[PDB]
């Protein structure tokens, strides 16, 4: 069974180690999986777990629509769910 | 098949509202539940999710098997599972 979260047949596995966005994307591609989509998890209960975690859009997943746009975030490192 | 983490039957439900230890225990008991035990989660993946969350022993869960006890956890507030 899934070793993490589950929601309509999508099993989310956490990777505790901090890594950049491109590193997260490469590691996710290695395990034949993709990073979470913000729209897929915005209204659901998974958000509390996914907060401050990388998303496919290239920015951290934040519940509030407000975001600190125009700020370079590529240099940051955060946990990723896949 | 619950809205949380499943391990060996027991289901863990996250509460994102910061509460003290006594309040966390009261809420968990009101929901017919008890706070997680350190022994069951120390050696399992669940730790990565329940780190810095309250436990039954009255201290935040920490990966270290043996650590100095601050004993001032009375005034601290952290999220809880149950």
């Amino acid at each position: 069974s899934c070793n993490g979260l589950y929601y309509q047949g999508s099993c989310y596995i956490l990777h505790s180690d901090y890594k950049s966005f491109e590193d997260a994307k490469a590691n996710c591609a290695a395990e034949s999986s993709t990073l979470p989509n913000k729209s897929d998890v915005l209204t659901t209960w998974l958000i509390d777990y996914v907060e401050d975690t990388w998303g496919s859009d290239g920015n951290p997943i934040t519940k509030t629509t407000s975001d600190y746009q125009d700020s370079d975030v590529s240099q940051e490192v955060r946990k990723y769910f896949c | 098949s619950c809205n949380g983490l499943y391990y060996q039957g027991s289901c863990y439900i996250l509460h994102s509202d910061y509460k003290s230890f006594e309040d966390a225990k009261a809420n968990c008991a009101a929901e017919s539940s008890t706070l997680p035990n350190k022994s069951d989660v120390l050696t399992t993946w669940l730790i990565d999710y329940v780190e810095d969350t309250w436990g039954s022993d009255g201290n935040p869960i920490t990966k270290t098997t043996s650590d100095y006890q601050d004993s001032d956890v009375s005034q601290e507030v952290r999220k809880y599972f149950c």
Epitope: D52, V77 | Y49
Partner: antibody, heavy 124, light 107 residues
Framework: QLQLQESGPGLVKPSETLSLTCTVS??????????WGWIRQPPGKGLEWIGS???????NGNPSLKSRVNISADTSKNQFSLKLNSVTAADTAVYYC?????????????????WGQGILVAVS | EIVLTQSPGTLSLSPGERVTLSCRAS???????LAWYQQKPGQAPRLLIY???SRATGIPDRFSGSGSGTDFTLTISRLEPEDFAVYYC?????????FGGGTKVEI
């Protein structure tokens, strides 16, 4: 109980390389939730962040010193070290080895709680 | 990039009053990143507030924090003799770390 202790010389010569090593007792440098960094305070002035390191090997440093900072980590001996080349008289300061906490997934702790005693380094 | 400026370099206060120390950011910075530290002479800094509102372990209830955006404040209701020290405001985001100039509490 996590204590950080610094060891190294205090007589670095101009145009040479410093060698400071910080060792941690009561914990393991292999901590997914924390970085380990060096912060220098010149005597009677404000703090300055001279670098950080992750157990994997990733290095982050302040751009003004990015050219001269080569931080290293050794997990087996549980020691993290700083090397500063092309030293100049303005670098004299008290150096602290600290733990830059990032926090767990649910608890976010963005601060450096544990600091070392600090080691004073000057120049000839 | 991000620079934190503490306008009041030094403050004069007698014991027992309430003191508010202000830290400003060049650009908007989220609350969770900000922190407030205290440093006595000849000792390493000790964490006072993290997240701008959370007291660290062992910090008395006198210290408290508030603010948002480009202005944050650390308020000490009662100034005991120990509270007289330098106070720093720090920005950390898992990347470049920045420290404030510092404000000294004397009489």
């Amino acid at each position: 109980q996590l204590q950080l202790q610094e060891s190294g010389p205090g007589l670095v010569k101009p145009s040479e390389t410093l060698s400071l090593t910080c060792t941690v007792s009561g914990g393991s440098i292999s901590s997914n939730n924390d970085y380990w960094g060096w912060i220098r305070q010149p005597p009677g002035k404000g703090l300055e962040w001279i670098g950080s390191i992750y157990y994997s090997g990733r290095t982050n440093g302040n751009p003004s010193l990015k050219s001269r900072v080569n931080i290293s980590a050794d997990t087996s001996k549980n020691q993290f070290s700083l090397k500063l080349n092309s030293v100049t008289a303005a670098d004299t300061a008290v150096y602290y080895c600290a733990r830059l906490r990032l926090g767990s997934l649910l608890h976010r702790y963005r601060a450096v709680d544990p600091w070392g005693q600090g080691i004073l380094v000057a120049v000839s | 990039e991000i620079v934190l400026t503490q306008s009041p370099g030094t403050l004069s206060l007698s014991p027992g009053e309430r003191v508010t120390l202000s830290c400003r950011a060049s650009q908007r910075v989220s609350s969770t990143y900000l922190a407030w530290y205290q440093q006595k002479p000849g000792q390493a800094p000790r964490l006072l507030i993290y997240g701008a509102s959370s007291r660290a372990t062992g910090i008395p209830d006198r210290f408290s924090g508030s603010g948002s955006g480009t202005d944050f404040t650390l308020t000490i209701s009662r100034l005991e003799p120990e509270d007289f020290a330098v106070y720093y405001c720090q920005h950390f985001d898992s990347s470049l770390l920045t420290f404030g100039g510092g404000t000294k509490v004397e009489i």
